[PDB]
Design a protein around this ligand. Structure first.
Ligand SMILES: [Mg+2]
Ligand SMILES: [Mg+2]
Ligand SMILES: [Mg+2]
Ligand SMILES: [Mg+2]
Ligand SMILES: [Zn+2]
Lengths: 242, 96, 124, 107
RNA sequence: ACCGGCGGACGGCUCAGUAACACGUCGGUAACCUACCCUCGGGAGGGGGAUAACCCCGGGAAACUGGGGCUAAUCCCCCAUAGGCCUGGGGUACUGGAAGGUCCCCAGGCCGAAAGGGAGCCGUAAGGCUCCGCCCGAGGAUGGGCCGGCGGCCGAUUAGGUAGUUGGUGGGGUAACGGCCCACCAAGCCGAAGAUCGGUACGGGCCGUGAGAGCGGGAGCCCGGAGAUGGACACUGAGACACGGGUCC
């Protein structure tokens, strides 16, 4: 990139969280800017063609997408470069199937089949919170989306809390606090894909990140970064997890 | 030659069904496309006009070959989806 | 000095070309761009050429011209000399690209014997 | 007042806008501890820290030293020979990128 | 075919220069920019103008290029409102380890938007109903800029080097911090633990060899850097001082 932004992406330099054959061809799809980040998302074309196998070539995959056969979080997506990330819901209504995108035990993205009723709710982690003109509170979630709340409820929401949002209407229906005894699911790091309950929280000076301790089902304790812990329930998960 | 069906899958999005099969034929040459298509349409009650044989492949020291084919429910959909070259190769349409 | 004259009628959009040389052409030498001169003084059968009745005392003003090598005249350069300057638009340059500039050779304002074509328009 | 270091602030105040305790300066990044070895220029000190480097082939150690120039607020005013604590900030001059925040042991 | 929009700054090639924050690695930006993309909150009122294409006449050996007539737009220009930026005085609503930050109220100024446009149906018509679009604000994402600590060649038959040089105060300039550049005040800064100068060379993941410890190389594939006959300098643009764009020697 001597004079401007990059537009291409070699197969060997593709993110390590995809299921893709790195030596079969030369090029890979460079994802469009969108909801999640590079390390936690995958272009839609690979979902249509490689994962589910509904298409054999890229050309016929685009014909499927242009007809509006795929729903991501309840909205039609036609761009084959659109990124799909953690906790998203992929729905095919014509075949009546639904999946949730989750990291594997080794850090790769997989599709987890889910019920139809569960397909209407998406958990969003409150990543940041700020004041906005007219004296309102804006919440910025982990997938880049935003929400507005009045000044009256400023004490019901804090960072690292989880909000259950009904899609595609984007309506709040549940708030899960981040506290001792809450049920969490790890999304990155060495202990990815493990789940459990919070035991302790530690803090450090000069802006180092804070750590949490989690007890799993069998009673073992392990530590991880606080921002890598995703709250999913009070004492039991509210969503299906593998 | 003996034809054995391995798997049949339904693709509602495209609007077609995909067929994988094996052909057992010791001491005989690789079967022609016409013979395989005739045998398949006889075996599964398919309209021959909307049936495309994607490929027939032989192996090094085997007595059997592997084949893959597709069947469309509508002629216009087949013309709209399939590449031109495969239709010419299968004799469905005439080359210019 | 022989001049090839292009007389344009603005009231109809039709133009005519005649060749003028001799003492009459000597009168035209020295004028800049943007000044009138009666055609009768120059001496021309205006009505016969255009096949149209014309008002009396009509005069024509100098609009442009080209030299014997094909270089044009630019109204914003004083004097009769020929120069080579960097241009971005205006007469004597067609850009073809946004923000493009190129070095071109042009003439000046004053008419000189080197000029061959002279474009003028009728002013009723 | 607290700036995230969890140490005692200086005794008195100053008017320097570049003082992290009383001005507008912000600190973020690495924090080091060292010995002052020069204070000739105005509001500037040189701090030296020593460490050991391991030579893999000869399986032995050698001593190396690192020298850093730091800003010296008037409210602290460190001198030659004492232990100081320095923190990283935005660039302040051609060679100054740290500021003294505490004197741990006066000479 | 022409006007208009987007792209042509990626990709492709080579290793001349460079011993340096160029590269590897851990961190920072509360000191910064970002067209295309995602979410949320709002807006689209009133006027004006030229010209290509097209017709008449051409100039020049050509490369190129002149005058006159006529016309449209998601082309161009104004007015309003929204909005942005600077400084002074108050209140403490937010994030964060910590506010020259964000939010609210007064006051003086400067800058200052938009295309309800296009396509299809039901409409006798009236008007809907989808699809693609235009502008402003808050955040993200993508792609970058800048900074710091540590790590990796040879020479003493090169021992002293530096004078905007090192730091301070007050400014300018930049997207942004900074001797980056000025005015003024001081005498600092580096060095036998090898400065300065000279030689050689793009850095790394890696590759060859050996029981190992080591010794030698770093063209081909990936990531980063630099260049377009040599040396200097600009226009447009979100992004260049631009390999198939411009100017000088
Ligand atoms: Mg390029
Ligand atoms: Mg070289
Ligand atoms: Mg205006
Ligand atoms: Mg080397
Ligand atoms: Zn102080």
């Amino acid at each position: 990139a001597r004079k401007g932004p990059k537009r291409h992406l070699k197969r060997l330099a593709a993110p390590t969280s995809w299921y893709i054959e790195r030596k079969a061809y030369k090029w890979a799809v460079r994802p469009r800017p969108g909801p999640h980040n590079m390390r936690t998302s995958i272009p839609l074309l690979y979902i249509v063609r490689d994962y589910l196998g509904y298409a054999k070539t890229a050309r016929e995959a685009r014909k499927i997408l242009n007809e509006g056969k795929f729903l991501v979080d309840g909205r039609v997506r036609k761009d084959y470069k659109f990124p799909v990330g953690i906790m998203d819901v992929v729905s095919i209504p014509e075949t009546g199937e639904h999946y949730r995108v989750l990291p594997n035990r080794i850090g790769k993205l997989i599709l987890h089949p889910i019920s139809e009723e569960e397909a209407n709710i998406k958990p969003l982690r409150i990543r940041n919170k700020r004041m906005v003109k007219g004296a309102k509170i804006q919440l910025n979630f982990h997938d880049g989306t935003n929400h507005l709340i009045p000044l009256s409820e400023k004490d019901n929401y804090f960072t690292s809390y989880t909000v259950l949002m009904k899609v595609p209407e984007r309506e709040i229906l549940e708030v899960l606090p981040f506290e001792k005894g809450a049920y969490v699911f790890v999304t990155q790091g060495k202990n990815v894909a493990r789940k459990g309950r919070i035991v302790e929280i530690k803090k450090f000076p000069m802006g180092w990140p804070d750590v949490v301790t989690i007890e799993d089902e069998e009673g073992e304790l392990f530590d991880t970064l606080k921002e890598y812990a995703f709250v999913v329930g009070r004492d039991k998960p509210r969503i299906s997890l593998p | 030659m003996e034809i054995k069906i391995t798997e049949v899958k339904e693709n509602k999005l495209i609007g077609r069904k995909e067929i994988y099969f094996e052909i057992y034929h010791p001491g005989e040459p690789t079967p022609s496309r016409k013979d395989v298509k005739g045998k398949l349409v006889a075996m599964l009650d398919l309209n021959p006009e909307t049936t495309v044989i994607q490929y027939i492949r032989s192996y090094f020291g085997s007595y059997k070959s592997k084949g893959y084919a597709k069947y469309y429910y509508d002629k216009d959909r087949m013309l709209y989806i399939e590449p031109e070259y495969i239709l010419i190769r299968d004799g469905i349409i005439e080359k210019k | 000095a022989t001049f090839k004259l292009v007389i344009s009628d603005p009231k109809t959009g039709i133009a005519k070309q005649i060749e003028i040389t001799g003492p009459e052409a000597e009168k035209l030498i020295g004028k800049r761009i943007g000044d009138q001169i009666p055609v009768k003084e120059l001496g021309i059968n205006l009505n016969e050429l255009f096949g149209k009745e014309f008002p009396e005392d009509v005069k024509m003003e100098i609009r442009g011209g080209t030299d014997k090598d094909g270089f044009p005249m630019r109204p914003d350069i004083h004097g009769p000399r020929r120069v080579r300057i960097l241009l971005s638009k205006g007469p004597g340059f067609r850009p073809k690209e946004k923000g493009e500039r190129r070095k071109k050779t042009v003439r000046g304002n004053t008419i000189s014997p080197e000029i061959v074509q002279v474009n003028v328009k009728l002013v009723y | 007042r607290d700036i995230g270091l969890r140490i005692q602030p200086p005794a008195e105040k100053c008017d320097d806008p570049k003082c992290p305790w009383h001005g507008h300066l912000k600190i973020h990044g690495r924090v080091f501890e060292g010995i002052v070895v020069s204070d000739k220029p105005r509001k500037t000190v040189t701090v030296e820290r020593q460490y050991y480097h391991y030579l893999k082939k000869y399986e032995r150690y050698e001593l190396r030293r690192s020298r850093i120039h730091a800003h010296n607020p008037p409210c602290i005013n460190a001198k030659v020979g004492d232990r100081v604590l320095i923190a990283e900030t935005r660039p302040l001059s051609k060679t100054k990128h740290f500021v003294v925040v505490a004197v741990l042991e006066r000479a």
